[PDB]
Every structure is written in C-alpha cells, then in structure tokens.
Design a protein around this ligand. Structure first.
Ligand SMILES: CC(=O)N[C@@H]1[C@@H](O[C@@H]2O[C@@H](C)[C@@H](O)[C@@H](O)[C@@H]2O)[C@H](O[C@@H]2O[C@H](CO)[C@H](O)[C@H](O[C@]3(C(=O)O)C[C@H](O)[C@@H](NC(C)=O)[C@H]([C@H](O)[C@H](O)CO)O3)[C@H]2O)[C@@H](CO)O[C@@H]1O
Length: 144
C-alpha cells in the first residue's frame, strides 16, 4: 500500500515533538488558553478538515516565543498541531493548503499532500509577523 506509506512518511516526519532544539512543552504546539508573556505569541489555526464530505472545525493553536525562526520550523510545528486533531492518520493522503497569513497580508502556503520543499527550509520568519494560520483540508474517504 503506497498511499499508506506516503501518509506514514508525513506522519513520521511531522508527529515528532521536537525540531532544532525546540519542543512541544505544556501542549504549546497543540492548544492553550494560558496567559502570554510579553515575549510570546499565540497563533490560532482557523479552518476546516472535511472527511468524506463532512466538515470538522478542530480548534488548535500554537504558542511560540517572539523570534526569527525558519519556515522548516514553523511548517513543522503547524503540521504537528494538525496531527493532534487527526491529520495524517490512517491510510489516505489529505489534500488542500495550510496557509500562514502575515499581519500585512503576506502568505506562506503549505501543501498538505506532500512534505515542505527542501529549497524553502531556510526562509526566515519573525513569529511576531504571523496573523493566523488558515486551512481547508480534505480527506476524500474514511478509513475502512
Ligand atoms: C516541484 C516543486 O516542488 N517546485 C517548487 C515550487 O512549487 C511548485 O510551484 C508553485 C508555483 C506551485 O504550483 C506548487 O504547487 C508547485 O509544487 C516552489 O514554489 C512555491 O510553492 C509553494 C506551494 O508548495 C507556494 O506556491 C509558493 O508561493 C508563495 C506561497 O504562497 O507560499 C507565494 C507567496 O507570495 C510567498 N510569500 C512571501 C512572503 O514571499 C511565498 C514564499 O516566498 C515561500 O512560501 C517561501 O518558501 O511563496 C511557491 O513559491 C518553489 C519555491 O519553493 O520551489 C520549487 O520550484
């Protein structure tokens, strides 16, 4: 099963709770309502995950330090938060984009069906520039 293997590759990459010395502490890469320090931001994931034509609206957010990070890092943490509601589980690949929206109207688009392209890994992003993350993801079939 090749579709299953492609799913497993995305799951194995993005389910890791560390990257480059950062880690998911206190569920900060999943969901928090805890008060923010002056040096933190909270980026809300606002979107839909539609499975076999039924829309789900999972509520997740990521709590990060204010700093310049790489797109590899932000892509990682964002997809980790998606995995926490069920993204990349089972045997079928999702499709659709996850979009990092910036405060002045910029975007970084993360295509969900494949890994981040290697040539994008080192793009530098100030976490304080991020407005939110939107997404419209589709999994065409349920697992049987
Ligand atoms: C085969 C392959 O992977 N080739 C990639 C390019 O990806 C292909 O071409 C794209 C135009 C698109 O059709 C894609 O589906 C193809 O796989 C890749 O180009 C980037 O691809 C991503 C999506 O995977 C985005 O479309 C990106 O555009 C944007 C973005 O939305 O992310 C536009 C945006 O305005 C811009 N924002 C800023 C602030 O600069 C961002 C940003 O530059 C990047 O996200 C930072 O990485 O890009 C396409 O540029 C291309 C560059 O990675 O490499 C191969 O050619």
């Amino acid at each position: 099963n090749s579709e299953k293997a492609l799913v497993k590759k995305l799951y194995d990459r993005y389910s890791k709770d560390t990257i480059n010395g950062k880690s998911n502490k206190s569920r900060n890469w999943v969901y928090s309502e805890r008060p923010l320090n002056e040096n933190q931001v909270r980026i809300h994931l606002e979107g839909t995950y539609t499975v076999a034509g039924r829309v789900y609206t999972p509520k997740r957010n990521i709590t990060l330090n204010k700093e310049v990070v790489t797109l590899k890092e932000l892509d990682h943490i964002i997809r980790f938060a998606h995995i926490s509601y069920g993204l990349y589980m089972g045997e079928h690949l999702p499709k659709g984009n996850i979009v990092i929206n910036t405060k002045n109207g910029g975007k970084y688009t993360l295509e969900s069906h494949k890994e981040l392209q290697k040539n994008r890994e080192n793009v530098e992003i100030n976490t304080d520039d991020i407005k939110n993350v939107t997404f419209e993801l589709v999994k065409s079939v349920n697992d049987i």
